[PDB]
Amino acid sequence: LPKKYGG
Amino acid sequence: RLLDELTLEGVARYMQSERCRRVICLVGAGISTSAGIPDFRSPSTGLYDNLEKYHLPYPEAIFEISYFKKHPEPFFALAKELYPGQFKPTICHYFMRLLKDKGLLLRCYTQNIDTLERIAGLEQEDLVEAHGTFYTSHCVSASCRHEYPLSWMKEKIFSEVTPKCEDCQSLVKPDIVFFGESLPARFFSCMQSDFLKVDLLLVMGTSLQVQPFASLISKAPLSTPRLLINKEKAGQSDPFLGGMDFDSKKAYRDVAWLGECDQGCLALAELLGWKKELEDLVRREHASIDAQ
Numbered sequence: 001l002p003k004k005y006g007g
Numbered sequence: 008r009l010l011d012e013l014t015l016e017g018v019a020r021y022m023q024s025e026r027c028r029r030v031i032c033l034v035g036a037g038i039s040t041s042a043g044i045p046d047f048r049s050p051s052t053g054l055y056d057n058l059e060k061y062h063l064p065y066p067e068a069i070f071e072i073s074y075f076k077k078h079p080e081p082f083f084a085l086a087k088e089l090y091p092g093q094f095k096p097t098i099c100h101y102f103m104r105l106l107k108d109k110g111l112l113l114r115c116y117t118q119n120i121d122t123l124e125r126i127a128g129l130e131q132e133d134l135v136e137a138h139g140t141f142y143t144s145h146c147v148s149a150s151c152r153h154e155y156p157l158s159w160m161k162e163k164i165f166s167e168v169t170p171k172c173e174d175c176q177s178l179v180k181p182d183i184v185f186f187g188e189s190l191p192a193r194f195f196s197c198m199q200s201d202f203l204k205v206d207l208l209l210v211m212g213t214s215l216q217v218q219p220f221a222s223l224i225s226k227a228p229l230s231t232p233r234l235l236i237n238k239e240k241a242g243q244s245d246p247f248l249g250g251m252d253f254d255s256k257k258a259y260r261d262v263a264w265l266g267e268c269d270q271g272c273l274a275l276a277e278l279l280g281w282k283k284e285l286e287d288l289v290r291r292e293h294a295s296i297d298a299q
């Protein structure tokens with residue numbers, strides 16, 4: 001699953 | 008078009024018609040500021056400003072999972088500084104409880120971690136907490152994962168004792184999504200099902216700037232009306248990088264009510280004939296919280 005990033 | 012006019016009155020009439028059965032709410036920090044909860048993703052809040060004494064490799068390290076697991080003390084020191092004095096949900100939160108009571112709430116997707124949706128009476132099934140929540144915490148060891156309630160976590164934060172698991176003595180972390188952690192599987196699974204079923208999108212207190220949450224508005228069926236209740240207009244295509252269309256001659260389903268989220272939800276409840284119900288619920292729940 002996608003990881004949490006700034007954007 | 009489903010709305011007879013692109014106004015709050017048009018949305019209220021649609022909500023009262025047989026066509027509007029299932030509402031999805033998308034909410035952000037703007038629905039909790041009147042509860043005293045600051046916007047944690049706003050540079051104006053200054054989260055990254057006074058971190059000198061922690062000697063971090065970079066300011067954002069205080070919210071990154073790998074750094075946290077090695078050096079959790081800075082995060083918990085900041086959590087004590089920012090911990091709210093009270094958890095009293097807003098008119099906006101209780102408006103969503105009314106939606107639930109009346110069988111209209113399909114789901115609330117929230118970017119907030121402050122637990123106010125739950126206090127206001129939304130249940131786990133009703134919620135997609137896109138960035139997790141402080142409501143529960145877990146031992147970080149994969150083989151253990153003991154769960155702890157917020158009262159347990161609060162006590163550790165305020166006594167300045169780094170929270171450790173009573174079973175295995177690993178760190179215990181609030182269930183918010185740190186940078187570098189996976190976003191919740193529930194966010195993607197619910198999105199794939201809910202937006203097949205939605206009749207109205209109620210977007211409140213979010214500037215729709217943080218992904219993937221902001222892309223939820225593009226998941227609505229083309230006919231589904233979308234109402235923004237927010238201090239500022241948001242969600243339109245970006246003339247540079249590039250969406251909501253409130254104002255063009257091609258606009259047909261998006262409506263912006265600009266003002267405080269509480270006043271917008273109050274105005275909508277009033278049009279719906281729910282104002283007394285909402286006042287009575289809020290005053291009762293606030294009285295109950297003030298009396299704890």
Ligand SMILES: *C(=O)C(C)(C)CSCCCCCCCCCCCC
Nearest residue numbers: 047070086089090121138141183184
């Ligand atoms: C991702 O964008 C996250 C989830 C990290 C944004 S939250 C960033 C700031 C968190 C500060 C720690 C919380 C302070 C205490 C809040 C208690 C609420 C119940």
Ligand SMILES: [Zn+2]
Nearest residue numbers: 146151172175
């Ligand atoms: Zn454990």
